[PDB]
Every structure is written in C-alpha cells, then in structure tokens.
Amino acid sequence: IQMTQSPSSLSASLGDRVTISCSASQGISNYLNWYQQKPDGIVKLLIFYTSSLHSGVPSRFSGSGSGTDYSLTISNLEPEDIATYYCQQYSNLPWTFGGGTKLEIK
Amino acid sequence: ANLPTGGQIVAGSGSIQTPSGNQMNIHQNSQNMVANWNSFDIGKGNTVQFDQPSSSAVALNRVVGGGESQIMGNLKANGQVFLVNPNGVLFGEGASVSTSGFVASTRDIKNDDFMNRRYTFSGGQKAGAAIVNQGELTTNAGGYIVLAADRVSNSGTIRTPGGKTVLAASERITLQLDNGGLMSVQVTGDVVNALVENRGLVSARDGQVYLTALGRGMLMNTVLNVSGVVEASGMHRQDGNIVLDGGDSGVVHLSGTLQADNASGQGGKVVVQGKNILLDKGSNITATGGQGGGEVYVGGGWQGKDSNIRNADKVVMQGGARIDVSATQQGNGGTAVLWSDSYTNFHGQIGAKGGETGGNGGRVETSSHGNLQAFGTVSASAKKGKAGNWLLDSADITIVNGSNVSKTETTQSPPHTQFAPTAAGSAVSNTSINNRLNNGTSVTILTHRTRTGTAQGGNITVNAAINKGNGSDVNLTLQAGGNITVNNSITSTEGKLNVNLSGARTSNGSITISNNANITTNGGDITVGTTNTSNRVNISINNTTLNASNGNIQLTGTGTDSGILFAGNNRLTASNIALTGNSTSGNAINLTGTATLNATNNITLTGSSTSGNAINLKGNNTLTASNITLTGESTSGNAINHTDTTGTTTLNATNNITMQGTRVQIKHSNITAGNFALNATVAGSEISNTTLTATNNINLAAKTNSASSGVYLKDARITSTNGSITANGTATANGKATHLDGNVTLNASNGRIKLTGNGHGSASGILFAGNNRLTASNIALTGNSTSGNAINLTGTATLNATNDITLTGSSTSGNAINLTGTATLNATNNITLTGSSTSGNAINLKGNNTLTASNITLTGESTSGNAINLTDTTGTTTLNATNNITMQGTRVQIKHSNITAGNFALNATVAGSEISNTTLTATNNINLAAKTNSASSGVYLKDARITSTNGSITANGTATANGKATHLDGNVTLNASNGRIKLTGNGHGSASGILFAGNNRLTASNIALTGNSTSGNAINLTGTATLNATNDITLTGS
Amino acid sequence: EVQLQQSGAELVRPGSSVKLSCKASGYIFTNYWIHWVRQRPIQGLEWIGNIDPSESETHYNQNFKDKATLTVDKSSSTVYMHLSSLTSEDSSVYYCARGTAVVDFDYWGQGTTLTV
Ligand SMILES: *[C@@H]1O[C@H](CO)[C@@H](O)[C@H](O)[C@H]1O
Ligand SMILES: *[C@@H]1O[C@H](CO)[C@@H](O)[C@H](O)[C@H]1O
Ligand SMILES: *[C@@H]1O[C@H](CO)[C@@H](O)[C@H](O)[C@H]1O
Ligand SMILES: *[C@@H]1O[C@H](CO)[C@@H](O)[C@H](O)[C@H]1O
Ligand SMILES: *[C@@H]1O[C@H](CO)[C@@H](O)[C@H](O)[C@H]1O
Ligand SMILES: *[C@@H]1O[C@H](CO)[C@@H](O)[C@H](O)[C@H]1O
Ligand SMILES: *[C@@H]1O[C@H](CO)[C@@H](O)[C@H](O)[C@H]1O
Ligand SMILES: *[C@@H]1O[C@H](CO)[C@@H](O)[C@H](O)[C@H]1O
Ligand SMILES: *[C@@H]1O[C@H](CO)[C@@H](O)[C@H](O)[C@H]1O
Ligand SMILES: *[C@@H]1O[C@H](CO)[C@@H](O)[C@H](O)[C@H]1O
Ligand SMILES: *[C@@H]1O[C@H](CO)[C@@H](O)[C@H](O)[C@H]1O
Ligand SMILES: *[C@@H]1O[C@H](CO)[C@@H](O)[C@H](O)[C@H]1O
Ligand SMILES: *[C@@H]1O[C@H](CO)[C@@H](O)[C@H](O)[C@H]1O
Ligand SMILES: *[C@@H]1O[C@H](CO)[C@@H](O)[C@H](O)[C@H]1O
Ligand SMILES: *[C@@H]1O[C@H](CO)[C@@H](O)[C@H](O)[C@H]1O
Ligand SMILES: *[C@@H]1O[C@H](CO)[C@@H](O)[C@H](O)[C@H]1O
Ligand SMILES: *[C@@H]1O[C@H](CO)[C@@H](O)[C@H](O)[C@H]1O
Ligand SMILES: *[C@@H]1O[C@H](CO)[C@@H](O)[C@H](O)[C@H]1O
Ligand SMILES: *[C@@H]1O[C@H](CO)[C@@H](O)[C@H](O)[C@H]1O
Ligand SMILES: *[C@@H]1O[C@H](CO)[C@@H](O)[C@H](O)[C@H]1O
Ligand SMILES: *[C@@H]1O[C@H](CO)[C@@H](O)[C@H](O)[C@H]1O
Ligand SMILES: *[C@@H]1O[C@H](CO)[C@@H](O)[C@H](O)[C@H]1O
Ligand SMILES: *[C@@H]1O[C@H](CO)[C@@H](O)[C@H](O)[C@H]1O
Ligand SMILES: *[C@@H]1O[C@H](CO)[C@@H](O)[C@H](O)[C@H]1O
Ligand SMILES: *[C@@H]1O[C@H](CO)[C@@H](O)[C@H](O)[C@H]1O
Ligand SMILES: *[C@@H]1O[C@H](CO)[C@@H](O)[C@H](O)[C@H]1O
Ligand SMILES: *[C@@H]1O[C@H](CO)[C@@H](O)[C@H](O)[C@H]1O
Ligand SMILES: *[C@@H]1O[C@H](CO)[C@@H](O)[C@H](O)[C@H]1O
Ligand SMILES: *[C@@H]1O[C@H](CO)[C@@H](O)[C@H](O)[C@H]1O
Ligand SMILES: *[C@@H]1O[C@H](CO)[C@@H](O)[C@H](O)[C@H]1O
Ligand SMILES: *[C@@H]1O[C@H](CO)[C@@H](O)[C@H](O)[C@H]1O
Ligand SMILES: *[C@@H]1O[C@H](CO)[C@@H](O)[C@H](O)[C@H]1O
Ligand SMILES: *[C@@H]1O[C@H](CO)[C@@H](O)[C@H](O)[C@H]1O
Ligand SMILES: *[C@@H]1O[C@H](CO)[C@@H](O)[C@H](O)[C@H]1O
Ligand SMILES: *[C@@H]1O[C@H](CO)[C@@H](O)[C@H](O)[C@H]1O
Ligand SMILES: *[C@@H]1O[C@H](CO)[C@@H](O)[C@H](O)[C@H]1O
Ligand SMILES: *[C@@H]1O[C@H](CO)[C@@H](O)[C@H](O)[C@H]1O
Ligand SMILES: *[C@]1(*)O[C@H](CO)[C@@H](O)[C@H](O)[C@H]1O
C-alpha cells in the first residue's frame, strides 16, 4: 500500500481555508490518521479515523472523505498551524505514511 | 507375326528396320524423335527393339490410324518409349515391356512440345478408348510407367522399382522429366466416365504410385477401383509411397491390398483421398515398419487439417476391412486417419500397436464433420511403450449400448447404398470403447458446434456403461463444445481410468452427470472442469458417485446462476477432492442434497460470486479429510453460507481446517478439527448452532466493515481438548467487534482463551449477551474502542480459570470495562482487570458480580471520569480473594459491595477514593491510600463496616485542594481488634484534615490519628465519635 | 501526562550496533503497544515495527526484519530497540510511539538522532 499526497507544499494567508488532500493507492475504508509534525520534531495525532478529532485538537481541524480520497481542513489558519501534515493509512500491513505537506504562510 | 506398319520418322534422326519377320528394330540417334505409325501392333513372339544412344534417349510412337494398339509380344528398349494411340492400347497376356521409361497415353501430344522436352498430354482421344494392360510392364531402376487415358485397366503386373507409377484418368496430364527420371506428374481435368481399375499387381518399391481419377459425373458410380495388390515398400516418402485420389466426384471402392511396409526402417505413407471412399471386406491397407509404423490417411489428414489432401465427403469402412500401421519389432506405432465432411461409417479394424520390444503405441483418428458411425475395433496398445490413442470427433456424439444398430454393410446392401446415412446422431458402440479401455488404449472424444441453425449443438451423451476390467493404465477424455450429459456408469476394476470430461476451450455448454451415473476409476483421476481457461461450464450432479480410490477428483467450472450444483445423494472418495467454481448471480458452489466427500488427504472448495454466494452448502453434507479448506469471495452475498433449517454440515479433519472469505456465515455445523481456523476479511463471520471441537489451537479471525458484528457466536459449543481458542474481531462500523450471544461454552482446559475485539468509532469492542460459560486454564479478553465500550459483559457470563483471568480495554469516551450483568469470574491463582479511558469510566461494575480468586488486581485511568467504579442502587459486587487485593486508579468509588480479602490495598492518585454502603472484611492489613487534587474527598467512608480480624487498618489521605483529606461520615465501623488503626490526613490550603461526622465506632488495639493542615482543622470530630482501644489512643495535628 | 521518553543523540561508525530505549510513563505500560517509526532525511516517514508489552508480541517490517530487533522490560516500563550493521543510509531520526489499535499513534517520543 502506497500513500499519495498533493501538494507537497502549500502557501496561504492567515485565516485562509486550507485543504490538504490525501489520495490513496486504493480504497482503505477509513483507516486514516492525520498526524501533524511541528517543525521542531514533535509529532501528534490530530484526526484519528477519517473524521474523528483527537483530545488536544482545536475545532478548526476537520476531515472527510471515503474510499480512495481524503482531505484534512484547517478552517482558520493561525501561525500555530505551520507544520508538516503526514496522512497515514493503517488498513493493510505494513503501515505506511504520506509524503508530508508543509503549510507555509504567505 | 504382326509388326507395326506405316512407320515414318517425322522429327529427329532414326532408322526403322525389320531384320526378321519376328524381329523389328529401331535405331535412335537424336535425343528426341517422333514416329507416326499407321498401326502399332506387336504379335505373339514378335519383338520391337529400340536402339537408342542413352537411357535418357526419347522415342515417341504416335498412332495416326488403324484401331486399338494390339501388343502381345515383347517390347524392349534401352531408353524411354512413349506410345500414343487415340483409339486405345491393349497389352495381352504374356506381353512384356522393358524400357528405361514408358508412357502409354490416349491423349495426343504436339510434336513441337515433344522435341522441346515438354511432355504434356491432352485431347485428341477417341471417345471410350481405354488402355488395358494384362501383360507385364517393367522398367529399369529409376524408370517410370504412366498410363493416362479415359479408362485405364491393369489386369497384369506393373513393376517400377525406385521410380514412379502413375495411372491417371484426366483430360490433361503433364509429365516432368529430368536426367532420364520422372520427378513430378500434373494431373488435371475431369472427363466423362473416368475410371482407373487395377485388378493386377503394381510394385513400386522405394518409389511412388499415383492412381488419380478425375471424373465429370459419376454421382455414385465407381471412379476408382483397386482390387489387386499395390506395393510401395521402402523408406517413408513425405509425398506418400502410395497416393490415391478420387477427384471431386465418384466413389473410390477399394477391395485390394495396399502395402507400404519397411522391414528395416519406418513404413511408408499411404494417402487415399476423394469424394466417396469405401474400403471393401478384403481391403488390407498396411503401413507397418520395422523401426516404426508409417502413416495412413483415408479421406484427409489429421482432423482434416492437412492442406495437401482433399477432404472426403463420405468414408465407409465395411466390417472386416483392415488398416494396419503397427510397428513390427521395435518403434512407435504409426498414424491411421479416417476423416469425412458429411458421414463416416467405420466397422473395420485398425492396428496402431507399438514395437513389441520397445516403442509407444500409434494414434488413430476416426472423425467426421457430420454424422459418425464408429463401430469397429482399434488396437494401439504397446507391449513396452505408452498406450496409443483412439480419437473421435463428430458434430454431436451419443454413446450407445452394443452394436445392434441395424447397420448396413453386407446384408441387404446393394452397391454404394452405404453412402446414404440413416442413423441420425453420431452413435458409438460402448462395446468398442469397452474393448479399447480393456486393451490398454486411450479414448478421446471431441465435438465442435456447426453453423447456427442446426440441432448439432456439439453435445456428448453417454447412453451406455463404459467399463475397463483389464489392461494397463489408460485415459478417456470427452471434450465437447456442447453438453457432457452422462447417464451411465463409467467403471474400471483393473488398472487406472483417468476420466477427463472437459468442455471445449470456447465452450458455452455445461456438464451434467445424473441418473446415478457412478464413475469408478480404481485409482484414476477425474477432471470434469478444464483448469484455468475461464471455460464457462456448469457441473450439475444428481445421485452421481465419483469413486477415485487412490486418484484425485478435480471439478472446475463457472456458472452465472450456478457454478457447480450438487443434488441428491453424492459420494466422492479420493486422495484429494478439489472443487473450483465461479458465478456472477447464482451460487458458485451449491450443495443441495446429501454430499459425502470422503477424502484421504485434501478437500479444497473455491468460489467467487459478485452477487450470489461463493460457497453455499445447505444439504446434509459430510466432508471428512485430513485438510479441508473452503475459500470464497463475495461482494454482495456470502462467501461461505452453510445455513439450512434442516440440513446439517459435518466436517471431520484429522489434521486441520482453514476457511477464508469476505463473510463466513457458518451454521448448524458439527466440526471436528485438528487446528481449526477461520479468516474473514470484509464482513466478519458468524458461528451459530454449531459444536466446533478441535484437538488443538483454534484461530477465529474476522473483520467487518458493516454494522454486522465481527465474530458473532450464538448457541456455539467450541472446545479445545489440548489447545487454545484465539478469536480476533474488528468492527469498523457501528457494529460490535466481537459479540457473544446465547448458550456459548468455550473449553481450553490445557490452553488459553484470547478474545480480541477492536472497535472503531461508535463500535463497541467485545460483547456478552445471554449465558456465556467460558472455561479455560487462562482467559484473556482484550478490547479497544473510541466511543463505545472496549469490553462489556452485559449478559450473564461464567468464567472458570485454573490459572488466571485478564481483561484489558482502552476507551476514548465510552467505558473500557463495563459489567452490567451477572458475571461470575472464578479463578484459582490470579484475576487482573486493567482499563484506561479519557472521558468515560475505566472499570464500571454495575450488575450483581462475583469475582472469586486468590489474587485480584484492578487498575484503570480516567482523565475526567471514574477509573474504578463499582456502584449500582441495586447491584451488589462481591469480591472473594484469599490473598492480596489491589485497586489502583485516579478515582475509586466502591458502593453496595461486599469484599472479603487476605490483604487489601487501594491507591487513588488524582481524584481520591470513596467507599460507601460496603462491607469490607480483610484478615490482614487493609491499607487504603488516596491523594486528591480536587474538591472531592480524599478518603470518603460512609455506612461502611470495615473489619480486620488479625491485621491493621491503614488510611492515608492527602488533599492538595480544599477537599476533605480523610472524611468519615455516617455509620462507619472499624474493627481491628488485633492490630492498629492509623488514619493520616494531609490537607492543604483551607482543606481540613481528618473529619468525623455521623456515628463512627473505631474499635482496635491501638488507635492512631495523624493530621496536617494549614488553615483547616487538622482533626475535626464533629458528630458522634466512639474510639475504643485496649492499649492507647494517639492524635496529632497542626 | 502521558510521556514517551527516549535516549539522547547516538552516533557510531557505520557497521556498529545501537540499542535505542523508549521509556514510558503516565499510563498503564501493559495497556498499549509501543511503535517504532523512522523519519528518513527529507524522504517521508516509514514504519519499522511494534512490540506489545503485554506479551512481547512483535510485528516487523520486512525491510527492517534483519536490521532491527525489539526487546521489552515491563519492570522499567521500557521498550528497547536493537539494531545491527548500521550504515550512513539509515542515519535518521527514530521515533517510538504509543499504539493502541484503534487510536494508533496518539503520543510520540521526543526522537533521538542516529548519525551513522
Ligand atoms: C471393382 O469395383 C467394382 C464396382 O462395382 C466391384 O464390383 C468389384 O468387386 C471391384 O473389384
Ligand atoms: C487384409 O489381409 C488379411 C490377411 O492378409 C485378410 O484377412 C483381410 O481380409 C484383408 O482385408
Ligand atoms: C480388446 O480386448 C477385448 C477383451 O474383452 C477383446 O475382445 C477385443 O478383441 C480386443 O479388441
Ligand atoms: C444438445 O442438447 C441440448 C440440451 O442440453 C440442446 O439444447 C442442444 O440443441 C443439443 O445440441
Ligand atoms: C439417450 O438417453 C436420453 C435419456 O437419458 C434420451 O432422452 C435420449 O433419447 C437417448 O438418446
Ligand atoms: C454397454 O456396454 C456394456 C459392455 O461392457 C454392457 O455391459 C452394458 O450393458 C451396455 O449398456
Ligand atoms: C494419461 O493420463 C495421464 C495422467 O494420469 C496424463 O498425464 C497422460 O498424458 C495421458 O496419456
Ligand atoms: C449445452 O446445453 C444447453 C442447454 O442448457 C444448450 O443450449 C447448449 O447448446 C449446449 O452447449
Ligand atoms: C472405489 O473402488 C475401489 C476399487 O478397487 C475400491 O478399492 C474402493 O474401496 C472404492 O472406494
Ligand atoms: C482435460 O483434458 C485436457 C486435454 O484435452 C487437459 O489439458 C486438461 O488438463 C484436462 O482437464
Ligand atoms: C436423486 O435421486 C432422487 C430419488 O432417488 C431423485 O428424486 C432426484 O431427482 C435425483 O437427483
Ligand atoms: C454409484 O453411486 C450411485 C449413487 O450416486 C449408486 O446408485 C450406484 O449403485 C453406485 O455404483
Ligand atoms: C448454467 O450456467 C449459466 C451461465 O454460464 C447460467 O445462466 C445457467 O442458469 C446455468 O444453468
Ligand atoms: C494429495 O495432495 C498431497 C499434497 O501434498 C499429496 O502429497 C498427495 O499424494 C495427494 O494425494
Ligand atoms: C474463475 O474461477 C477462478 C478460480 O477461483 C477465479 O479466480 C476467477 O475469478 C473466476 O473468474
Ligand atoms: C442453490 O441450489 C438450489 C437448488 O435446490 C437453487 O434453488 C438455489 O437457487 C441455489 O442457490
Ligand atoms: C494438503 O495441502 C497442504 C498445503 O496446504 C500440504 O502441505 C499437504 O501435504 C496436503 O495434504
Ligand atoms: C439431512 O438430514 C436431516 C435430518 O436427518 C434432514 O432434515 C435434511 O433435510 C437432510 O438434508
Ligand atoms: C494435510 O494433512 C496431512 C495429514 O494427512 C498433514 O501431514 C499435512 O500437514 C496437512 O497439510
Ligand atoms: C472425525 O473423523 C474421524 C475419522 O478420522 C472420526 O473418527 C471422528 O469421529 C470424527 O470426529
Ligand atoms: C494445518 O494448520 C495448522 C495450524 O497451525 C498447521 O500447524 C498444520 O501444519 C496445517 O497442516
Ligand atoms: C494440530 O496441529 C498440530 C501442529 O500445529 C498437530 O500436531 C496436531 O496433530 C493437529 O491436530
Ligand atoms: C486473515 O487473512 C489474511 C490474508 O489475507 C492474513 O494475513 C491474516 O493473518 C488472517 O487473519
Ligand atoms: C442458531 O440457532 C438458534 C436456535 O437454535 C436460532 O435462534 C438462530 O437463529 C440460529 O442462528
Ligand atoms: C445452546 O442451546 C441449544 C439448544 O438446542 C444447543 O443446541 C446449543 O448446542 C447450545 O449452545
Ligand atoms: C488481530 O487483529 C488486529 C487488527 O484487527 C491486529 O492488530 C492484531 O495484531 C491481531 O492479533
Ligand atoms: C496462562 O495459563 C498458562 C497455563 O494455563 C500459564 O502457564 C501462563 O502463565 C498463564 O499466562
Ligand atoms: C457502562 O455502564 C454504565 C452503567 O453501569 C453506563 O452508564 C455507561 O453508559 C456504560 O458505558
Ligand atoms: C497474579 O497477580 C499477581 C500480582 O503481582 C502476580 O504476582 C501473580 O504472579 C499472578 O498470578
Ligand atoms: C459509575 O457507574 C454507575 C453504573 O454502575 C453509573 O451510573 C455512574 O454514572 C458511574 O459514575
Ligand atoms: C497473588 O496470589 C498468588 C497466589 O500464590 C501469590 O503468589 C502472589 O503473590 C499474589 O500476588
Ligand atoms: C470467598 O472466598 C473464599 C476463598 O477466598 C471462598 O472459600 C468462599 O467460598 C468465597 O465466598
Ligand atoms: C501481597 O502483598 C503482601 C505485602 O503486603 C505480600 O507479603 C504477599 O506476599 C502478597 O501476596
Ligand atoms: C496478607 O498479606 C500478608 C503480608 O502483608 C501476608 O503475610 C499474608 O499471607 C496475606 O494473607
Ligand atoms: C500508591 O501508588 C503510588 C504511585 O504514585 C506508589 O508510589 C505507592 O507506593 C502506592 O502506595
Ligand atoms: C501515605 O502514607 C502511607 C502509609 O499509610 C505511605 O505508604 C505513603 O507513602 C504516604 O503517601
Ligand atoms: C487491543 O488494543 C490493545 C491496546 O490497549 C493492544 O494491546 C491489543 O493488542 C489490541 O488487540
Ligand atoms: C437420466 O435420464 C433421465 C431421462 O432423460 C433424466 O431425467 C435424468 O436427469 C438423467 O440423469
């Protein structure tokens, strides 16, 4: 199972509707986690399952999708969000990860 | 004496002399010359001698008058002699011709062509003129003899060793010569009343014989007739040692013997082509060979696909007729072919036996594009080599019993009336094929659908028993383009009978074995499918027994409405029974009646259906074998559904079982296995009303993507005499990851139990309803969920562990371990319940629960709720532990409980602990520790009656927030008559220390109170307090 | 709070071996399995293997099957990652993660630098 991310990098403005699509090599039902890695190196889990928030997750983060396409959306962009968002599948062994999408401001 | 008269040299240079009355001499000087004669007649005792410069020297005697040439004397020449007489030529008895090459033709040849060495003969003949040879015509080695006429007859003998003998009946005949020999002959042009008859002997050893007759009419009249002996012994010439041709019209009635044998090497090639070819009773076409048999073709090549041989319209083989291509000493047998495009009636004998001292058997094909009547005998056996093959091919073929089919060969048979077929449908006597299997020869039967509009769909119908009670290993393959309707046993007592009821590669038909058509193979294989060609073929079966003894039974086929269907009472005994089926809308495998698939080694059922069921067994089917594996894939239906309100599925594995599928819905089954293992990967599985007993490990793994429960067990008794049951359920939808229901009992007396349930989203984890009596030497229940419960035993559950019980859960918002029902977890050595949660409770015992063991260890963590919560306004929790009890968590709330213990230990680290309305007895120490960081009480006891028979009660509360460090209220009773009571309370901020209200009776030997508070009361005994001590009472505070 | 403490920076010559430690606190150590994820330099993340402290059951990625080995000590609440035959290519940042089954990697370690 191979994961696909696009775009590999994104630039936008404060509070702009941000969308990081994450397409899969096949239908993985909903076995998707949205890890956010801050530039320092701390890696969290933001949306386990396709759309299911984690504990330390502000309401701005919200996903959707099914089958082969999935997206993670940050409704209001604030400079805390600047990070790389590895979308991870876990339907089929071995587990794999996305290519990373750095969210740069403009 | 009568010598030719009127001789006149027209071209070339030569002299004609008559030195005697009986001797006539011609002197040839030039290479080519034509001599025209008023009459060319040789009387008895007269000699016509040619004196020519070489053996390639050419002399032509064209008759330009008189009548038919009358040659009774001897004609001798050192070169080539060509005689042309439009009136015909006759060679009487005793006449002898001996030249280096001789041509007798009724067709005139132009002089210009002759001097230019262009030997073509056409036209100019008298109507009805014939060339009749009753004497002896011989040539030197490498010579040739040609008789081209409207009609040619040879009642004498013809001998051209090492050359070519050609008898043609055509308008135009073209002869190609080179270096004094004959290389090729071109025969073309139909003529009226054409015929070439040979009642004598023709020998062309190491050469070739061509008997071509091209007729204009003869709808049923004899166009070619060889009743004598034709011999072309020698090496196997690829052009054929003997070649016959009947043209496009007429009947080739052959009654004599054709010989192309080779005592020292490979036999010759005999080809007989025409429109209608009949071989009489005395026909003896032989192509044997010392080092291997030759080849024989009657009406065409193999399968009629040889482009060098014309395909006959009808070929009839009268009874007693014989074609022999068998090897004589050592070598492989040859090929004998009988092909026709309309109708083949075969009654003769064909020999394709291999060499006695070595070599494989030959191959025989008796095939007709239309109607086939194969009733004769064939022999392609081998004394040392592999068996031969008797191949058949017709439009549609139906096996019949015996040979009493009112055949028309010799009795009430006018001449050439056998060319009118009467028995529609290509009947074949089972007696013939019975002998073929009995004599160690394979049988192969094919069909092929004709053009649309005919009833000849290409079917096979066995309407007679096929037996093999003698002989070595043989094969029998029936591959039709239509149906394989079998309605008669195919048995074999001696040897092996490998049956292959294949369908055609592009077949669109099906295979039906019904009417109790048992197939016994005495160790032979049965392959009713094809294997991998995606050949759409249904395999319907009804009361058919497939006994393979020591062979392997493989059925394959794809049926949109039913891949392979089983009905009635079926029995299938074999070393390996491999069923493979596919479907689109119907059941890929559908066993409806009783199916007893007794196997010694391996049973394998495979299916795949888009909408229907892959494997759908509803009958009283019994499947006993060492290893049975049912693999199925279904997108809309069931991979493995065995549901039946009356039918029961019995499985007996001496070694192990494996079932795989998108959804495995087993039901009403009785399975004995060595190492059973399911694996569902799409829609979970279901075990209902089964009694699955296995000697060793059982591995029920299933994942469901739908609301249906993953591992759904209901009224199932699953036992492991020596192994462990490991179940692994996973539900990604609002279903339950593992759901236990109804009277389920699990026995792992010498092993483990591991029920793992991974919920997702709203999915609950493991579920328990009804009465579940899990007995094992080790029980472990693992669950994981987010909003639902990681582990829940709502229904009555009984667990008896000889060693220990372990429950583990992890719930994001729901309850990790929830016991809202009568749970009786008896165990000998240990019991541990571990949980963890964020919003909900970690451990939440609600119903009437009893947890008996020597060692109980509860633990849980909750961010905002209660970790260890044992409370219900009705439910009563009883804990019976001989040895230590440990409870650790952030919040411990014990209510309506009745605990007995050897030792006891709480530990609250975040939210403190509360004990209320409980009766806690513990012989030795009852150390209770609790640290709270919120306004809740540190150690909150109310209406609790705690007893220490031989031990010491120890409480130690710390409240960093403004809650009560250690608050006792109401009817608290503490008996520690043989030990010490020590309650330590550390408050902070405005928090009090040890607060006593209500009515507290603290009885003990030594009573010690300790408090530490900043702004609150270190010790505050507000209500009624009563402390009775036998040694001393100590209180301190700040 | 639930923490995943690891070792500091580890540097060895290529062809050496290093045993990485993942120390866990603030949660039931035998209630979740520990994961192991490598962040290759400027190429995306990748999964190595996991070991469940409840029974030391391990699943290994085939690429690291002969490259990594996992050991667990329940007493110290620690999972140890063993390595062999290191090269400069494997020089990356190695993360240990707390894996449940449905919650997956809800907490990651601080990460150690393995320069080889
Ligand atoms: C030659 O062919 C004729 C056909 O009538 C048959 O009668 C003779 O027996 C055979 O020699
Ligand atoms: C073939 O030859 C045998 C014996 O030479 C004779 O019995 C058959 O009648 C003939 O066809
Ligand atoms: C095949 O074997 C049988 C024995 O039943 C014999 O009768 C036939 O003559 C031979 O072809
Ligand atoms: C063979 O038999 C079938 C019935 O199975 C009939 O439909 C075809 O026409 C015939 O060729
Ligand atoms: C072969 O047998 C079937 C019955 O099985 C019959 O219907 C046909 O007429 C016969 O040829
Ligand atoms: C088919 O032929 C066999 C010969 O073995 C006979 O036994 C059966 O009675 C007939 O149907
Ligand atoms: C006879 O049958 C075997 C299988 O038993 C096959 O391999 C040979 O090709 C056939 O002659
Ligand atoms: C098989 O039988 C069917 C009838 O079901 C017939 O239609 C096909 O022609 C034959 O192949
Ligand atoms: C099948 O037939 C064979 C014949 O030898 C017999 O031995 C087996 O018991 C039977 O199943
Ligand atoms: C049926 O027979 C064929 C040859 O015609 C063989 O290739 C297949 O293996 C068997 O099923
Ligand atoms: C099996 O046999 C029964 C009666 O014995 C018949 O009713 C079914 O049609 C056949 O399949
Ligand atoms: C083969 O099996 C059938 C039942 O399938 C039985 O009727 C026959 O007697 C047996 O030879
Ligand atoms: C035989 O199989 C065909 C599809 O191949 C199906 O349409 C028929 O109903 C079944 O009998
Ligand atoms: C059935 O298949 C097994 C496969 O191992 C083989 O060993 C047996 O000889 C055969 O009967
Ligand atoms: C034909 O049957 C095979 C054997 O299972 C299956 O793989 C194909 O999908 C089906 O078309
Ligand atoms: C299973 O087989 C039965 C025949 O009894 C058929 O009616 C069903 O359609 C098939 O699923
Ligand atoms: C059954 O099949 C297994 C492989 O699945 C093989 O190992 C056995 O020899 C055979 O009986
Ligand atoms: C199997 O046997 C049961 C009872 O013996 C009957 O109810 C089912 O119909 C048959 O398949
Ligand atoms: C198939 O069954 C045999 C015993 O008959 C066993 O040895 C193999 O391991 C199994 O695959
Ligand atoms: C499974 O099958 C065996 C035969 O090996 C039988 O003895 C047992 O009774 C059944 O459970
Ligand atoms: C049947 O399945 C078991 C499962 O462990 C395996 O051990 C045996 O080798 C195989 O025959
Ligand atoms: C279960 O599997 C084991 C090997 O795993 C074998 O020894 C037993 O015979 C079988 O029942
Ligand atoms: C289910 O089947 C799969 C193969 O698709 C295997 O990997 C799992 O171990 C078994 O549970
Ligand atoms: C299993 O059997 C029970 C009662 O025998 C029935 O209620 C369920 O529907 C079936 O699955
Ligand atoms: C539950 O009770 C039913 C009643 O028949 C029994 O069949 C099952 O075996 C048991 O699990
Ligand atoms: C059971 O299946 C789960 C996934 O559902 C896997 O994580 C465990 O390793 C296996 O035991
Ligand atoms: C599970 O049970 C076994 C024996 O039943 C014991 O040896 C293990 O220690 C316990 O985990
Ligand atoms: C666990 O059970 C309690 C009652 O005991 C219920 O309130 C919760 O909703 C459940 O998760
Ligand atoms: C039960 O649990 C206790 C807790 O320490 C352990 O020591 C025993 O070994 C186990 O049986
Ligand atoms: C403790 O558990 C009870 C049910 O047993 C529930 O009602 C409470 O809300 C919880 O704190
Ligand atoms: C739990 O109980 C057992 C019983 O022997 C004891 O050995 C352990 O020390 C205690 O934790
Ligand atoms: C309480 O526990 C003891 C042993 O711990 C047992 O004897 C009693 O039966 C049960 O009530
Ligand atoms: C329970 O804990 C005590 C210490 O209080 C220890 O002595 C016992 O061995 C164990 O069962
Ligand atoms: C309670 O715990 C003590 C040690 O505190 C141990 O000695 C007794 O055996 C047990 O009952
Ligand atoms: C209570 O729990 C704490 C953990 O914070 C441990 O240190 C004490 O030993 C136990 O009494
Ligand atoms: C509170 O007091 C207890 C003894 O009662 C001690 O074990 C704990 O360490 C302290 O926090
Ligand atoms: C369920 O989840 C737990 C983590 O709490 C894991 O240990 C088990 O392996 C999985 O089945
Ligand atoms: C035997 O033949 C009868 C009559 O055609 C048919 O009804 C059966 O299905 C077949 O096996």
Numbering used by the authors:
A (entry chain L): 21 to 126
B (entry chain A): 66 to 1103
C (entry chain H): 20 to 135
Wording from the paper:
EtpA, is a secreted glycoprotein adhesin that functions as a blood group A lectin to promote critical interactions between ETEC and blood group A glycans on intestinal epithelia for effective bacterial adhesion and toxin delivery. Once secreted, the high molecular weight (~170 kDa) EtpA glycoprotein serves as a unique molecular bridge between the bacteria and intestinal mucosal surfaces, essential to pathogen-host interactions required for delivery of both LT and ST. Similar to other TpsA exoproteins, the mature EtpA molecule forms an elongated and slightly twisted 3-sided parallel β-helix ~25 nm in length that can be divided into amino-terminal secretion (NTS- residues 66:640) domain, and carboxy-terminal repeat (CTR–residues 641:1534) domain. Perhaps the most striking feature of the EtpA structure is its unique and extensive surface glycosylation.
Here we provide the complete structure of EtpA determined by cryo-EM, both alone and complexed to anti-EtpA monoclonal antibodies produced by vaccination, as well as high-resolution mass-spectrometry (MS) analysis of EtpA glycosylation. MS analysis uncovered extensive and heterogeneous N-linked glycosylation of EtpA and cryo-EM structures revealed that mAbs directly engage these unique glycan containing epitopes. Our cryo-EM maps confirm the location of many of these hexose modifications, as shown in the refined model. Although previous analytical studies of HMW1A reveal a mixture of glucose and galactose residues, we are unable to differentiate between glucose and galactose with MS alone, so all hexose residues were modeled as glucose for consistency. Intriguingly, N349 has the second highest occupancy of any site as determined by MS (~96%) and N849 is in the top 17% of sites by occupancy. This could be taken as evidence that antibodies targeting PNGS with higher occupancy are enriched during affinity maturation, or conversely, that heterogeneity in glycosylation is being exploited as a mechanism of immune evasion. The local density analysis also reveals that it would be difficult for antibodies to target an entirely glycan-free epitope on the CTR domain, while there is ample glycan-free surface area for potential antibody binding on the NTD. To understand how EtpA directs ETEC-blood group A interactions and stimulates adaptive immunity, we mutated EtpA, mapped its glycosylation by mass-spectrometry (MS), isolated polyclonal (pAbs) and monoclonal antibodies (mAbs) from vaccinated mice and ETEC-infected volunteers, and determined structures of antibody-EtpA complexes by cryo-electron microscopy. Both bgA and mAbs that inhibited EtpA-bgA interactions and ETEC adhesion, bound to the C-terminal repeat domain highlighting this region as crucial for ETEC pathogen-host interaction. Collectively, these data indicate that the C-terminal repeat region of EtpA is essential to ETEC virulence, and that antibodies targeting this region can effectively inhibit interactions with the host.
